């Protein structure tokens, strides 16, 4: 599960809403740990 | 991160070159569809 917001909330070009800033836990090298990763995704690759 | 403004990807085609290319295509289509047939081009409709 990703938690996402808009990358550029104040943008009026055709790119408004196209890039989302998503947060997720992922995995790490050791099975006991988790991390927090922030990354940008394109709207076309992410489903609500 | 985006190191500057967020801009949309795009492609440029010269208008005069395309207009001549398309006219040539129309002439070759007329050879199969008729000298007095109207040849219209339109964008793709359905699908992904």
């Amino acid at each position, epitope marked *: 599960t990703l938690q996402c917001t808009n990358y550029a909330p104040k943008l009026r070009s*055709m790119m408004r809403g196209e890039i989302k800033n998503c947060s997720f836990n992922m995995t790490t090298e050791l099975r006991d740990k988790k991390q927090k990763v922030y990354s940008l995704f394109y709207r076309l690759d992410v489903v609500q | 991160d985006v190191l500057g*403004h967020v*801009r949309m990807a*795009h492609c440029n085609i010269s208008k005069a070159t395309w207009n001549e290319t398309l006219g040539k295509v129309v002439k070759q289509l007329r050879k199969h569809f008729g000298n007095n047939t109207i040849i219209r081009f339109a964008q793709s409709s359905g699908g992904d």
Partner: antibody, heavy 128, light 104 residues
Framework: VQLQESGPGLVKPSETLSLTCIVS?????????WSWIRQPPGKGLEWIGN????????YYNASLKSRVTISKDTSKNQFSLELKSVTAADTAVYYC???????????????????????WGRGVLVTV | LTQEPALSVALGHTVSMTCQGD??????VNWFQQRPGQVPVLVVY???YRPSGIPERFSGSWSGNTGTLTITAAQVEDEADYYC???????????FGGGTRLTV
């Protein structure tokens, strides 16, 4: 670019006020918004309304809208504000101003930014 | 829009003037300065851009649903009313704060 304004100055209650904004060194037909702003001595800068310089589209202040008309004359590069039923609340300094649009990318893709009030005129003080 | 009615700072000290509203999620805060009796000017616009002619002391931030104008080491020439100006969410170009009275 410089902006200048003129008008009747003192009017009586229920009379209609007509203010004219003129420009120096510009052309109103550009893709810029032109606006009128009201500032009475005890308040801040309260927008009156605006008109698009290139298209004629207008917006108005909803509490004022029904009694205010804003128009532009492409000829002579001029704007005017027509305010009906002028009352004591209108004893304020009137300003004309222009917005501008900056460009960082492709114009046809909307890759522009707003700069809402780049140049201000000196304004005129009216009384009622 | 709501903003601090007044701020009092010693000469030579930095100030931070903050405005808040609902439309600031989608619009940038445009900071204006009006010295009493003078024509107002634009101080900060868009994505923290500075118009030519404004000293480097004036800068700001649009984080969250607020906007902040920071004047580093405020000078006597900066004594003016300051206003946080932005557009309304309906598209109407008016949403304007009461103004902050800055005394140095």
């Amino acid at each position: 670019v410089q902006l200048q304004e003129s008008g009747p100055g003192l009017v009586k209650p229920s009379e209609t006020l007509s203010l004219t904004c003129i420009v120096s060194g510009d052309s109103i037909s550009s893709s810029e918004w032109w606006s009128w702003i009201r500032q009475p001595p005890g308040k801040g800068l309260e927008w009156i309304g605006n008109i698009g310089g290139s298209s004629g589209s207008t917006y108005y202040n909803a509490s004022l809208k029904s009694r205010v008309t804003i128009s532009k004359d492409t000829s002579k590069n001029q704007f005017s504000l027509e305010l009906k039923s002028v009352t004591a609340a209108d004893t304020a300094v009137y300003y004309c101003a222009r917005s501008s649009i900056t460009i960082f990318g492709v114009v046809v893709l909307g890759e522009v930014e707003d700069k809402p009030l780049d140049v201000w005129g000196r304004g005129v003080l009216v009384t009622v | 829009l709501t903003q601090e009615p007044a701020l009092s700072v010693a000469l030579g000290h930095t100030v931070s003037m903050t405005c808040q509203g609902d439309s600031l999620e989608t619009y940038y805060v445009n900071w204006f300065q009006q010295r009493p009796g003078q024509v107002p000017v634009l101080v900060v616009y868009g994505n923290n851009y500075r118009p030519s002619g404004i000293p480097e002391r004036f800068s700001g931030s649009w984080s969250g649903n607020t906007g902040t104008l920071t004047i580093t080491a405020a000078q006597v020439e900066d004594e003016a009313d300051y206003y946080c100006n932005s557009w309304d969410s309906s598209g109407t170009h008016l949403l304007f704060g009461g103004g902050t009275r800055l005394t140095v």
